[model samples]
Target: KVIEVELNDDYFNPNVITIPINESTTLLLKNKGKSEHTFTIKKLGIDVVVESGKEKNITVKPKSAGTYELICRYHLLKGMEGKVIVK
Candidate 1:
């Protein structure tokens, strides 16, 4: 299966995403802002970037069921963040 998300100026649309445990899913990440953006999920090792005004697709497979945090490093101070729910 696959999922979709977008990183904007100061936030992410559908900020919280959930997927099944041990499942490989395509995370279609889109950046709608003029500047660069980031997607960092520590425990799940998804720290990657989506170019400015572009989209990047990556595969994610969670080893365990839990919630993970995604911080856009560039705008972390502004509270730009994301969440992943694995079940």
Candidate 2:
């Protein structure tokens, strides 16, 4: 399934997301902010650019169940962080 997410100026709409473990899911990411952002998940080996007014997709198939940290590289410390829960 496709999980739509929006990257805003200093936050992400629906900062928390959930998906099934060991299943393929696509993250349909949209950038709605003026600055460029990134969707990064080190543990899951996901790193993608999200330019302003652009959209991107990151397909993830989590092999394990856990909470993964999602952050925007440009605004990591500005409280621009989220969670990905794989169950």
Candidate 3:
């Protein structure tokens, strides 16, 4: 199934996103806030932008089952953090 994540001001909803280890997953990043946000997972080599009112889709094919940190480089201090779990 597709996993949709909300990129609102200062944070992201559904903080804990899951991905199937055996398959590639598509992540929908929805920016519903007044300003633009970011979608990043350094460990996964993912760093992208999501403009306000816009959205983006990222494909995830994990090689391991573990936790990966998600952050918004633009608003990291706003507690805009989450986790991507491969299971």
Candidate 4:
């Protein structure tokens, strides 16, 4: 599935997503609002840096079942975050 996420004011929407085990998912990140945002699943070491008016494409395959924190380093204090849950 093409997961749609919005980046605005250093934050991301739908902060959390759940998927089945060993599922292949495509994450489409669009800077639909404004400002630059960075999305990263630290534990999985997956990072995508997208600029304003730009988009980034990524695929995630998680081996373990758990939740991952998606973060934006630039907006740490502003509560810029997202989540990924693997079932």
* Models, CA RMSD each: 0.9, 0.8, 0.9, 1.2
Clashes per prediction? 0, 0, 0, 0
Error of 2 at 25 (Å): 0.5
TM-score ranking from best candidate downward: 2, 1, 3, 4
True lDDT of residue 57, candidate 4: 84
TM-score to true structure, per model: 0.94, 0.95, 0.93, 0.90
32-84: candidate 2 lDDT, tens digit per residue: 99999988887888889899999998888999899999999999989999999
Kindly provide the TM-score of model 2 when superposed on the true structure, using C-alpha atoms.
Answer: 0.95
Q: Considering summed lDDT, which 10 consecutive residues are worst modelled in model 4?
A: 31-40
Q: Pick the candidate with the highest lDDT.
A: 2
lDDT of each: 0.88, 0.91, 0.90, 0.83
TM-score, candidate 1, is 0.94
Q: Which residue pairs overlap in candidate 2's backbone?
A: none
Cα deviation in Å at residue 31, candidate 3?
A: 0.3
For residues 1-87, could you state the per-residue lDDT of candidate 1 as single tens digits?
Answer: 668888989788889998888878899889998778898898887788888989989898898999999889899888999789999
- For candidate 3, write residues 7-59 as lDDT tens digits: 99889898888888878998889999998889998888888899999999988
